[PDB]
């Protein structure tokens, strides 16, 4: 009388014929996510095939389909980004809850459609107060994760996030959107952080808020970390790694919470070492090295290799406005230790490229006897997008993990470095930054 696989056979027979309309496939996807059918991939694929192939789409069926795609955890870029046609064409015809669901579920998959996000931000910046704050958090999430660095929406959303008290889930979505934006406006993040005081109804709430606070590098909140140490069973390993990483970047000392988050990722790595991305293994190594927590003996060395792999892959695919910056900083660092002509500049630049202990290649590394001083260049991509322009938390992450390898990381940001008029002022700034961390040089 209550049988799940028989109704899954019924839905599989439903979306296998020729004449599935929009409402039928939208209903099939909703009834799939209400039944938690992740074990059966091909039935989900039939639903996505008939959802991409369908030609009619009204507002309700498209909204329910995008809701089911986002909530079911299913990703397929072709069928999701080909739903943006019905998203743009019905963008007047969507209610604010529907427009929020549509733009959030299309921003989740990384759909690079700038006209949809531009028009949705325009509609939500004309009618600001009409949207409930969860809806403006969803539109902020969708415009932030779709590649749009829209900041008019960010300030006009932070006004509402500071005026009216929002939910924990709404504030977590707002924080994660601001972390992808890279904003670090303390006046609105601190207004959003009062919502994390009643306890988190979901573990993804506290995990995403911890990652957002860590990536903007503020602090812990004493109730996010309690929710994480209380409910780290409802986290995927790729989610719990980002939770521990956002805790360690924010400066947390609660090693019990790191034990809780590590005891759900380390059985996942020991079960399948190939299940997580190398970026996630680097985040696990940074979280395990900064907070002083421990790992198993086969996992600590594994993420010790994998952090070197992730730093090398970030080195090789450098954006070549950072490569000119590293050449500039290495030239000013060669001059700062005595170089008045060009061949000694080039021979001192070509000697700063010594190898790290874990296998990675450090661009500027100086050894005077036993003292290793590294210089880090932070171009614009690892800076905060607001006008004070402080570096992000991943910068301090790399600095604090190289400090555990024995290096004195003199971080040189490029909001200040490229404003100096001559190369001698750049050598002055590089020596002032090296003397600040290790004045023995």
């Amino acid at each position: 009388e209550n049988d799940v696989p028989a109704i899954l056979k019924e839905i599989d027979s439903l979306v296998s014929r020729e004449a599935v309309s929009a409402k039928e496939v939208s209903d099939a996807a909703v009834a799939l996510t209400y039944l938690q059918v992740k074990a059966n991939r091909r039935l989900w694929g039939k639903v996505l095939e008939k959802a991409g192939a369908a030609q009619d789409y009204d507002a309700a069926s498209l909204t329910n389909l995008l809701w089911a795609i986002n909530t079911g955890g299913v990703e397929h870029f072709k069928t999701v980004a080909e739903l943006a046609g019905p998203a743009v064409s019905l963008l007047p015809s969507l209610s604010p809850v529907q427009l929020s669901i549509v733009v959030e579920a299309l921003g989740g998959a990384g759909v690079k459609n700038y006209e949809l996000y531009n028009k949705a931000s325009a509609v939500v910046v004309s009618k600001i107060g009409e949207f409930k704050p969860a809806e403006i958090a969803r539109v902020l999430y969708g415009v932030a994760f779709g590649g749009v660095n829209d900041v008019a929406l960010a300030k006009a959303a932070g006004k509402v996030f500071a005026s009216t008290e929002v939910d924990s889930r709404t504030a977590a979505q707002a924080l994660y959107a601001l972390a992808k934006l890279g904003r670090a406006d303390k006046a609105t993040v601190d207004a959003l952080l009062k919502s994390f005081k009643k306890g988190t109804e979901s573990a993804s709430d506290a995990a995403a808020a911890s990652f957002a606070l860590g990536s903007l590098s503020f602090k812990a909140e004493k109730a996010i970390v309690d929710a994480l140490k209380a409910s780290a069973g409802d986290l995927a390993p790729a989610q719990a790694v980002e939770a521990a990483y956002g805790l360690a970047l924010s400066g947390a000392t609660d090693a019990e919470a790191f034990k809780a988050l590590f005891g759900v990722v380390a059985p996942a790595i020991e079960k399948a070492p190939d299940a997580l991305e190398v970026s996630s293994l680097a985040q696990l190594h940074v979280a395990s090295t900064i907070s002083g927590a421990k790992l198993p003996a086969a996992v600590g060395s594994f993420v010790a290799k994998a952090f070197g792999l992730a730093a090398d892959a970030a080195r090789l695919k450098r954006s070549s406005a950072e490569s000119a910056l590293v050449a500039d900083v290495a030239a000013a660092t060669a001059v700062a230790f005595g170089a008045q002509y060009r061949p000694e500049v080039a021979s001192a630049v070509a000697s700063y490229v010594k190898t790290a202990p874990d296998g990675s290649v450090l661009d500027i590394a100086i050894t005077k006897g036993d003292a290793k001083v590294l210089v880090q260049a932070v171009p614009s991509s690892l800076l905060t997008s607001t006008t004070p322009a402080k570096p992000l938390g991943h910068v301090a992450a790399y600095s604090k993990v190289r400090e555990a390898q024995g290096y004195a990381v003199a971080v040189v940001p490029a909001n200040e470095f490229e404003a100096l008029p001559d190369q001698k002022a750049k050598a002055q700034y590089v020596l002032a930054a090296i003397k600040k961390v290790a004045p023995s040089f």
């Binding site: 991939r41 080909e82 943006a84 046609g85 531009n118 900041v151 994998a306 892959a313 874990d358």
Partner: protein, 290 residues
């Protein structure tokens, strides 16, 4: 095996035959093997050549996983196609395509002192119509100055050239002012996002029109090939396709021991497996063990 620099491009890659190589290398590193040192050598020519021949090993399998939007009406399939090409370029180590072709411009003509040598060295990376229009604007400025228009920017010859280059740019349909205000930046963010929200709408129209032109070329090529092929009798079609398949299979059976011939034969056997497994159950499709 993987040669320790192929693995570094494949971490952000997501095609299957590279993802299995990453996962095999990480399974090798899990069972007590050491990660080699990344080579602190290979000066900028060999480094750029290694980039050129390592990013192609990500671009080339990543192209064949991107379905063309052939014969689709609307603006969203073309935007999906160009968005997938953007994500492939971002996973292959390329930058934003605007930034990359700008870097190619600044790399080709770092030392061209007049505007004619800039306009003749990057003739290829610009359309020949826009290059011919810039040649006629340059000769219209040289008809007044009777000197080579200096590629300096503060020279009044270059300013009188730029006041007509902006004219031919807006005449070509592209807003020069929006692009210039974006790439020169601005001070306040409340006026910088209002030029970003015009430059990126131009940019979305730009790559949408370019990917749509590529799709129109593939549509016209497929229509030409089919309208040639449907004129033939059946037996000529069958024997010429069997002959071309036999010759292209003899090209792979001629080479032995090489990796591409072996992978070619493994892919032929995988295609025959696909045909046999569809034949085993045609209403359900190929057998995928989950």
């Amino acid at each position: 095996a993987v040669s320790k620099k192929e693995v570094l491009y494949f971490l952000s890659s997501k095609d299957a035959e590279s993802s299995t190589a990453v996962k095999s290398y990480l399974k090798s590193l899990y069972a007590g093997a050491q990660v080699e040192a990344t080579e602190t050598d290979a000066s900028e020519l060999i480094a750029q050549l290694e980039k050129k021949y390592l990013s192609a090993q990500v671009v080339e399998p990543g192209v064949h996983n991107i379905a063309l939007p052939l014969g689709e009406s609307g603006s969203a399939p073309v935007k999906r196609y160009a968005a997938e090409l953007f994500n492939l370029g971002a996973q292959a180590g390329f930058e934003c395509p605007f930034i990359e072709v700008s870097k190619k411009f600044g790399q080709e003509t770092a030392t061209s002192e007049t505007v004619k040598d800039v306009l003749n060295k990057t003739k290829s990376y610009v359309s020949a119509d826009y290059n011919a229009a810039l040649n006629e604007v340059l000769s219209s400025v040289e008809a007044e100055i009777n000197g080579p228009v200096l590629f300096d920017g503060k020279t009044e010859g270059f300013k009188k050239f730029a006041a007509k280059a902006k004219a031919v740019a807006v005449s070509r349909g592209l807003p020069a002012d929006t692009i210039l205000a974006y790439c020169a930046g601005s001070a306040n963010e409340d006026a910088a996002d209002k030029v970003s929200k015009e430059f990126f709408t131009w940019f979305e129209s730009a790559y949408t029109a370019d990917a749509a032109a590529e799709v129109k070329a593939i549509e016209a090529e497929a229509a030409s090939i089919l309208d040639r092929h449907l004129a033939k009798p059946v037996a000529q079609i069958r024997k010429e396709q069997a002959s071309a398949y036999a010759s292209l299979l003899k090209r792979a059976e001629t080479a032995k021991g090489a990796k591409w011939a072996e992978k070619y034969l493994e892919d032929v056997k995988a295609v025959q497996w696909f045909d046999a497994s569809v034949a085993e159950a045609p209403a359900s499709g190929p057998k995928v063990a989950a």
